[PDB]
């Protein structure tokens, strides 16, 4: 299940008539397909390098940003995508990515997660080398239930 | 519309018995009993079987033979009798409970030939399941023909109607249960086993499941011995069937004047001589412990434990312990397990167990999932099984921390409050505990305090009346005497014992003495005060200090010694002897 | 009309069913009440303002206006409730194109121990305290499978090989029924103080479906009205577990509003309060079954009177409760003090360290539920914890947080909330090693960390000193107690326990001290003296809390001259009692004047 989360381009945590909107959407979709302009692409490339240096961002996320920028340019029926369009796409993706930081707080499925999983591995090795009682104890040790289950499955595979 | 002539005749005769039979006063006792039954929480009425037998022997014989067949009609008769008499709620369940049944069968004797007939059995509860409502007379509606099926009685299983109510419609598969209209009754599944009295030696006991309902649901708690009056029945299990004893009434199993009247002339004469026998203390100690040498103080303390003090409950709902707890810390060998085994063998209600027991109960009540039902059940432990008896626990130093805290709570409050997995209960446990333990490292270091010698927690040690230290003396005479005892026992296979009193005589004397509740005289009060003054003034160095807990133990031992001679009041002799015992049990550091 | 043959059958009849429906709908318009404000119109407008589909109907109005209808409500709860629901839905649609009707003000209120089979499948109102609650469980569906190659239907199977032919086919669903389309399960037990001591408090399970979901929090005393009926449960055939289908819920503000007293007794209480010496008598009556430990008695009286919680506001709130910790060597009857305060103070609970709250998967089912611990259960009451020195590390952290905040914030799986516990902790524990060590201080000779020690207004040490006269008095007292209670048996004068309880309730709920005047100069000088001698503002806040408590003991309005003196005496005596032998002697010598002030 959590693997699917990696393939979602955008993830968020909680006038014109409907028919006219649908007609405009169909018209734009069938008529205009935008592309990234050299200036916009270079801006995105530099921004991506900055985000990697600060960090996380992955090449798939770069492709998602490119698709969002193309959609934004298509809204205006422009053959190409302006660097301002890349900036708007980046604003949306930065909303998604700070939301993603607090989602790593929510999910974290991650250097800290890897470290705590290693802690669980060490603790279980020390203990042994009922099931409900073990799960309850590890959960009381701040270990997420999903992390405990993943560690158990991995050790079963080994 | 088929009328069971037997059932109708039994109903008529039962109603006549209720509305005519009268006590020696000439008034219908059951009228007043039902008048009491009108109150809420009182939906079961007891009936004396002998009384109705006298009223109509044929009726009693028929009920005994076909109790299960006629019981619903008896309940209907009770309903009719109570409804028209007073302002009772128009519709609430009522039941009839039968007692005074002379025939007391054994769980071994429960055979299929006894199915459906009334009988009384005696057993010890082992585990108790949660209460659960259960449908008895279900009501369904056919989905296709939307006709309400009513009073489709179910025989302890999810029995849907065989076919629709309507002859026109034959759905036969889509009946819908009408929960509101369905009749439910509260059932509790209990498990009982043969009491040790009836248990043959080295024979696995018979476990019998019983169903409790109405007033009897909470009457029986785990670990207690009770007698059930009811009827054995069969219940289908996933044409398989299994036996279950549906018990209408539950009572505790079985005064000094009453015992003496019941006691035989020769037995009462023997007990009277025992009471009038001076020096009975040492004589009884020696008789009860033939295969032992020395350790006279240990035997004295064990006997005093066997007798026990007078329990007291304060006006503020506080229970003051009446029985005493003894611990024996001893070097390897030295006959500790022998002491415990003797105590267990002699005294009924005494159970021997070890601190290494791995049972889910773990030497006390626990909550465990049933392997089949998978529902949490309160399982009684050995300590509970020793209710109003003695628990000889060996390897006391090796108990687990879980059992250690449970036992601490038990000996502190005399009751165990067990709550877990949503189940909750408060099991009474007034049990004298005789523990055996070994010093840390195996050998007792007399130059160290007792705390340093044993691993028991401070609360456990504090709540023990007497500690007896058994040190393996190097004296040649003692070892020679021990060898003499053992060799004489092994050579003279029997007849080596010199029992001034027989074991059965000792048992009956103990039962007679238990009936007394010695009081404390003002002379006894001040003597106790002065003895505690001296004990406090001693203030030493002693292994463990002296607190008011020691004063409580002193008064309990004095009560037990008063019970020894059966005198109803305390005398300075008992107090001074108890003071001697407790003070001697104290061991000072030899450094 | 009425007087048929069975109430359930009578209501089931279509004729009378529609008769009652039309009568209720007409009543939805006629009942303008003596006020003439069209009460039902007001309720409809209020509901549609927020569209809550939750209507409140007072049983008194129905009984007075209709009588027979309200009489039939208890016997046929579901039918008439559905009638009222459809009537309300029609009215709302007419005025503003499902509506749930919740009843209240039931005349008879029954305790959990007071309900039996006579009350099965009927609406009833009870008063209880929540103990545990789960999430918004989606649905409980019972599935019955038509057998594969055999004329038989497999028994109901709960969700959220044939018994006769042993067919191995997958079978096909003969009938599936949905129950509790969206529901929350809670447990309510008898409110503390109504239990008959030894009796274990009764508990019952309530289900709140759609409406009223998440309308209660664990540890909240609620008057719950609902249908006490049998029903399936999550467990051959499924077990039929009796539950209460919640129709209406309420909140008992302050957790205590009995107000039950005799005006004559109130006047007597006030007159005694005017009598100054009564304070000493109160102390004397703290431990009728104990001799000695007068300081412990004063501390326990202070804790019972607690203190007025001052609230600076957003920054924090001054917890007016007085937290006490009794420590000492065994045989000091600490547990006897705990039992005394438990039996005397109303709305108090007792427990042992071997609390707070926590979410766990209810073992009976597969469902995570939050369980309300001792602290939250007490809420606005008194919590006694014996063996406080023995607790889990997680328990230690949680209790430290609760004492630091008087409220625990839970953020467990699918459950984020905060349980408030304004509970006066009277905890007790034993030294580390049993015997008390005069050299090692309180924080050293006891296995408790400093964060817990900090959040304790009073710390007291009980020493089993070897003193002849006092020991003789103790022996006399215990012997007298033993003899007078034999089963075959049947300074200032103290205060009767009943009147003492009346005083506690009245003072704790009426008098609230204040600080109109200011001796801040003396307080600050004393604090500077203490700093020069050793103290933190925690001592100052505890001092003012206990001063407020002492003022409440005498029903003083702002403060009395000796109030600050008593608070300082208590604080200084405790602080000295938690020092080393040499340090204790030094503090006693330096503070001899302050202690001698008395
Ligand atoms: N003082 C004694 N007088 C008589 N017999 C003794 C004495 N001490 C030991 N014995 C004999 O020692 C034999 C073996 O001792 P036993 O097996 O009962 O020891 P134990 O108390 O269970 O030892 P431990 O629990 O320390 O292992 C017993 O049959 C008993 O007869
Ligand atoms: N001052 C006193 N007056 C009267 N009885 C007292 C006094 N001090 C102690 N006791 C007696 O002490 C007995 C034992 O006290 P209790 O069991 O409550 O102690 P505790 O503090 O819980 O001990 P522990 O540390 O062993 O758990 C009580 O029955 C009480 O009668
Ligand atoms: Mg042994
Ligand atoms: Mg205690
Ligand atoms: Zn049909
Ligand atoms: Zn089949």
From Swiss-Prot, chain A:
It comes from the Eukaryota. The modification N6-acetyllysine is found at residue 136. It is found in: Nucleus; Chromosome. It is linked to Meier-Gorlin syndrome 8: A form of Meier-Gorlin syndrome, a syndrome characterized by bilateral microtia, aplasia/hypoplasia of the patellae, and severe intrauterine and postnatal growth retardation with short stature and poor weight gain. Additional clinical findings include anomalies of cranial sutures, microcephaly, apparently low-set and simple ears, microstomia, full lips, highly arched or cleft palate, micrognathia, genitourinary tract anomalies, and various skeletal anomalies. Belongs to the MCM family. Component of the MCM2-7 complex. The complex forms a toroidal hexameric ring with the proposed subunit order MCM2-MCM6-MCM4-MCM7-MCM3-MCM5. Component of the CMG helicase complex, a hexameric ring of related MCM2-7 subunits stabilized by CDC45 and the tetrameric GINS complex. Interacts with ANKRD17. Interacts with MCMBP. Interacts with TONSL; the interaction is direct. Acts as a component of the MCM2-7 complex (MCM complex) which is the replicative helicase essential for 'once per cell cycle' DNA replication initiation and elongation in eukaryotic cells. Core component of CDC45-MCM-GINS (CMG) helicase, the molecular machine that unwinds template DNA during replication, and around which the replisome is built. Early fractionation of eukaryotic MCM proteins yielded a variety of dimeric, trimeric and tetrameric complexes with unclear biological significance. The MCM2-7 hexamer is the proposed physiological active complex. This is DNA replication licensing factor MCM5. It comes from Homo sapiens. The gene is MCM5. The chain holds residues 507 to 718 of 734 of the full protein.
Curated annotation (Swiss-Prot), chain B:
It comes from the Eukaryota. ADP binds at residues 549, 552. It catalyses: ATP + H2O = ADP + phosphate + H(+). The chain holds residues 17 to 661 of 821 of the full protein. Belongs to the MCM family. Residues 280-487 form the MCM domain. Disulfide bonds: none annotated. This is DNA replication licensing factor MCM6. Changing residue 133 to S: Found in a patient with mild developmental delay and autism spectrum disorder; uncertain significance. One of its GO terms (molecular function) is ATP binding. Its EC number is 3.6.4.12. Keywords: Acetylation, ATP-binding, Cell cycle, Chromosome, DNA replication, DNA-binding, Glycoprotein, Helicase, Hydrolase, Nucleotide-binding, Nucleus, Phosphoprotein. O-glycosylated (O-GlcNAcylated), in a cell cycle-dependent manner. It is found in: Nucleus; Chromosome. GO terms for biological process: DNA replication; DNA replication initiation; double-strand break repair via break-induced replication; mitotic DNA replication; regulation of DNA-templated DNA replication initiation. Acts as a component of the MCM2-7 complex (MCM complex) which is the replicative helicase essential for 'once per cell cycle' DNA replication initiation and elongation in eukaryotic cells. Core component of CDC45-MCM-GINS (CMG) helicase, the molecular machine that unwinds template DNA during replication, and around which the replisome is built. A motif (Arginine finger) lies at residues 462-465. ATP binds at residues 293, 333-337, 438. The modification Phosphoserine is found at residue 203. Early fractionation of eukaryotic MCM proteins yielded a variety of dimeric, trimeric and tetrameric complexes with unclear biological significance. Specifically a MCM467 subcomplex is shown to have in vitro helicase activity which is inhibited by the MCM2 subunit. The MCM2-7 hexamer is the proposed physiological active complex. The modification N6-acetyllysine is found at residue 573. One of its GO terms (cellular component) is cytosol. Its main location: nucleus.
Curated annotation (Swiss-Prot), chain C:
GO terms for molecular function: ATP binding; ATP hydrolysis activity; DNA binding; DNA helicase activity; DNA replication origin binding; enzyme binding; histone binding; single-stranded DNA binding. The modification Phosphoserine is found at residues 191, 289. There is a cross-link at residue 3 (Glycyl lysine isopeptide (Lys-Gly) (interchain with G-Cter in SUMO2)). One of its GO terms (biological process) is DNA replication initiation. The modification N6-acetyllysine is found at residue 41. Its EC number is 3.6.4.12. It is an enzyme of class 3 (hydrolase). Acts as a component of the MCM2-7 complex (MCM complex) which is the replicative helicase essential for 'once per cell cycle' DNA replication initiation and elongation in eukaryotic cells. Core component of CDC45-MCM-GINS (CMG) helicase, the molecular machine that unwinds template DNA during replication, and around which the replisome is built. Early fractionation of eukaryotic MCM proteins yielded a variety of dimeric, trimeric and tetrameric complexes with unclear biological significance. Specifically a MCM467 subcomplex is shown to have in vitro helicase activity which is inhibited by the MCM2 subunit. The MCM2-7 hexamer is the proposed physiological active complex. It is linked to Deafness, autosomal dominant, 70: A form of non-syndromic sensorineural hearing loss. Sensorineural deafness results from damage to the neural receptors of the inner ear, the nerve pathways to the brain, or the area of the brain that receives sound information. DFNA70 is characterized by slowly progressive, postlingual hearing impairment. This is DNA replication licensing factor MCM2. The chain holds residues 176 to 825 of 904 of the full protein.
């Amino acid at each position: 299940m959590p693997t699917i989360l990696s393939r979602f381009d955008m993830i968020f945590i909680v006038e014109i008539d409907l028919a006219k909107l649908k007609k405009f959407i169909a018209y734009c979709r069938v008529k205009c397909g935008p592309r990234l302009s050299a200036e916009a692409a270079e801006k995105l490339k530099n921004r991506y390098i900055i985000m990697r240096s600060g960090a996380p961002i992955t090449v798939r996320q770069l492709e998602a940003i490119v698709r969002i920028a193309e959609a934004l340019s298509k809204m205006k029926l422009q053959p190409f995508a302006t660097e301002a369009d890349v900036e708007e796409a980046l604003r949306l993706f930065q909303v998604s990515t700070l939301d993603a930081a607090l989602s790593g707080t929510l999910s974290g499925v991650s250097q800290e997660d890897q470290e705590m999983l290693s802690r669980i591995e060490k603790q279980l090795k020390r203990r042994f080398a009922s099931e409900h009682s073990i799960i309850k104890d590890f959960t009381k040790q701040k270990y997420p239930e999903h992390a405990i289950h993943k560690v158990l499955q991995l050790m079963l595979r080994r | 519309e088929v009328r069971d002539e037997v059932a109708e005749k039994c109903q008529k005769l039962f109603l006549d018995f209720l509305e005519e039979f009268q006590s020696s006063d000439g008034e219908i006792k059951y009228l007043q009993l039902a008048e009491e039954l009108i109150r809420p929480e009182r939906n079961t009425l007891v009936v004396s079987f002998v009384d109705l037998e006298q009223f109509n022997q044929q009726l009693s014989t028929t009920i005994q033979e076909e109790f299960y067949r006629v019981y619903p009609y008896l309940c209907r008769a009770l309903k009719t009798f109570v409804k028209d008499r007073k302002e009772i709620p128009l519709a609430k369940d009522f039941y009839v409970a039968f007692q005074d049944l002379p025939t007391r069968h054994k769980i071994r004797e429960l055979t299929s030939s006894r199915i459906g007939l009334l009988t009384r059995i005696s057993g010890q509860v082992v585990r108790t399941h949660p209460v659960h409502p259960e449908l008895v007379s279900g009501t369904f509606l056919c989905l296709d023909c939307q006709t309400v099926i009513r009073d489709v009685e179910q025989q302890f299983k999810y029995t849907q109607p065989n076919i629709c109510r309507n002859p026109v419609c034959a759905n036969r598969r889509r009946f819908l249960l009408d929960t509101n209209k369905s009749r439910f009754v509260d059932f509790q599944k209990v498990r009982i086993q043969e009491t040790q009295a009836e248990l043959p030696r080295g024979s696995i006991p018979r476990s019998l499941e019983v169903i409790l309902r109405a007033e009897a649901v909470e009457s029986a708690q785990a670990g207690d011995k009770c007698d059930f009056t009811g009827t054995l029945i069969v219940v289908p299990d996933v044409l398989s069937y299994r036996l279950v004893f549906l018990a209408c009434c539950v009572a505790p199993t079985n005064t000094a004047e009453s015992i003496k009247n019941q006691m035989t002339v020769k037995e009462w004469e023997k007990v009277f001589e025992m009471s009038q026998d001076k020096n009975l203390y040492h004589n009884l100690c020696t008789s009860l412990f033939p295969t032992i040498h020395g350790n006279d103080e240990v035997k004295r303390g064990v006997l005093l434990m066997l007798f026990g003090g007078v329990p007291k409950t304060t006006g503020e709902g506080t229970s003051l312990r009446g029985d005493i707890n003894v611990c024996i810390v001893g070097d390897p060998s030295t006959a500790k397990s022998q002491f415990l085994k003797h105590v267990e063998e002699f005294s009924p209600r005494a159970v021997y167990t070890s601190g290494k027991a791995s049972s889910a109960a773990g030497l006390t009540a626990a909550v465990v999932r049933d392997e089949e039902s998978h529902e949490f059940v309160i399982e009684a432990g050995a300590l509970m099984l020793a209710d109003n008896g003695v628990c000889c626990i060996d390897e006391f130093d090796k108990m687990d921390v879980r059992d250690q805290v449970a036992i601490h709570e038990a000996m502190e409050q005399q009751t165990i409050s067990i709550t877990k997995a949503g189940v909750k209960a408060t099991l009474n446990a007034r049990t004298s505990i005789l523990a055996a333990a070994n010093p840390i490292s195996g050998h007792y270091d007399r130059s160290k305090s007792l705390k340093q010698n044993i691993n028991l927690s401070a609360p456990i040690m504090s709540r023990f009346d007497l500690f007896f230290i058994l040190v393996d003396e190097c004296n040649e005479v003692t070892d020679y005497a021990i060898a003499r005892r053992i060799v004489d026992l092994h050579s003279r296979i029997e007849e080596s014992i010199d029992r001034v009193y027989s074991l059965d005589d000792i048992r009956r004397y103990l039962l007679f003495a238990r009936q007394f509740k010695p009081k404390i005289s003002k002379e006894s009060e001040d003597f106790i005060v002065e003895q505690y003054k001296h004990l406090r003034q001693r203030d030493g160095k002693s292994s463990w200090r002296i607190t008011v807990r020691q004063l409580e133990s002193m008064i309990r031992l004095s009560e037990a010694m008063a019970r020894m001679h059966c005198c109803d009041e305390v005398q300075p002799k008992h107090v001074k002897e108890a003071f001697r015992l407790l003070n001697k049990s104290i061991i000072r550091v030899e450094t | 009309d009425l007087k048929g043959h069975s109430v359930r059958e009578w209501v089931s009849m279509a004729g009378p069913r529609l008769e009652i429906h039309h009568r209720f709908k007409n009543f939805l318009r006629t009942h303008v009440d003596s006020h003439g404000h069209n009460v039902f119109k007001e309720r409809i407008s209020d509901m549609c303002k927020e569209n809550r589909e939750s209507l409140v109907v007072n049983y008194e109005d129905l009984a007075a206006r209709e009588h027979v209808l309200a009489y039939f409500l208890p016997e046929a709860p579901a039918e008439l409730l559905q009638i009222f629901d459809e009537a309300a839905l029609e009215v709302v649609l007419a005025m503003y194109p499902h509506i749930h009707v919740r009843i209240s003000h039931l005349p008879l209120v029954e305790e959990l121990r007071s309900l039996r089979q006579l009350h099965l499948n009927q609406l009833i109102r009870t008063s209880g305290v929540v103990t545990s609650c789960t999430g918004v469980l989606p649905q409980l569906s019972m599935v019955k499978y038509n057998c594969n190659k055999c004329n038989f239907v497999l028994g109901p199977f709960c969700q959220s090989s044939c018994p006769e032919c042993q067919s191995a086919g997958p079978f096909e669903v003969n009938m599936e029924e949905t129950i509790y389309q969206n529901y929350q399960r809670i447990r309510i037990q008898e409110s503390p103080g109504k239990v008959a001591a030894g009796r274990l408090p009764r508990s019952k399970d309530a289900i709140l479906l759609a409406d009223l979901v998440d309308s209660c929090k664990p540890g909240d005393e609620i008057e719950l009205t609902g249908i006490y009926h049998n029903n399936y449960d999550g467990s051959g055939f499924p077990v039929f577990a009796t539950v209460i289908l919640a129709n209406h819920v309420a909140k008992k503000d302050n957790k205590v509003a009995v107000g039950e007293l005799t005006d004559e007794d109130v006047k007597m209480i006030t007159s005694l309060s005017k009598d100054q010496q009564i304070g000493e008598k109160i102390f004397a009556s703290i431990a009728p079954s104990i001799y000695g430990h007068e300081d412990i008695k004063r501390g326990l009286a202070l804790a019972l009177f607690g203190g007025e919680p001052k609230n600076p506001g957003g920054k924090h709130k001054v917890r007016g409760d007085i937290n006490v910790l009794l420590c000492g060597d065994p045989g000091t009857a600490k547990s006897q003090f705990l039992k005394y305060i438990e039996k005397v103070s109303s709305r108090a609970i007792f427990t042992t360290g071997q609390l707070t709250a926590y979410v766990q998967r209810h073992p009976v089912s597969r469902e995570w539920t939050l369980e309300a611990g001792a602290l939250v259960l007490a809420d606005r009451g008194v919590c006694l914890i014996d063996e406080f020195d023995k607790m889990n590390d997680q328990d230690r952290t949680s209790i430290h947080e609760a004492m630091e905040q008087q409220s625990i914030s839970i953020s467990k799986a699918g459950i984020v909330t905060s349980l408030q516990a304004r509970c006066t902790v009277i905890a007790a524990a034993n030294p580390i090693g049993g015997r008390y060590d005069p050299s090692l201080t309180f924080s050293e000779n006891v296995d408790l960390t400093e964060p817990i020690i900090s959040r304790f207004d009073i710390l007291c040490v009980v020493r089993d000193t070897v003193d002849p006269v006092q020991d003789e008095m103790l022996a006399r007292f215990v012997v007298g107690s033993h003899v007078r209670h034999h089963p075959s048996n049947k300074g200032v004068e103290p205060l009767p326990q009943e009147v003492l309880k009346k005083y506690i309730i009245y003072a704790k709920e009426r008098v609230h001290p204040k600080l109109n005047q200011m001796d801040q100069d003396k307080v600050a000088k004393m604090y500077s003296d203490l700093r020069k001698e050793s103290i933190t503002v925690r001592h100052i806040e505890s001092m003012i809390r206990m001063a407020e408590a002492h003022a409440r003991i005498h029903l003083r309005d702002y403060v009395i001259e000796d109030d600050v003196n008593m608070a300082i005496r208590v604080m200084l005596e405790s602080f000295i009692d938690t020092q080393k032998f040499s340090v204790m002697r030094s503090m006693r010598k330096t503070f001899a004047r302050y202690l001698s002030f008395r």
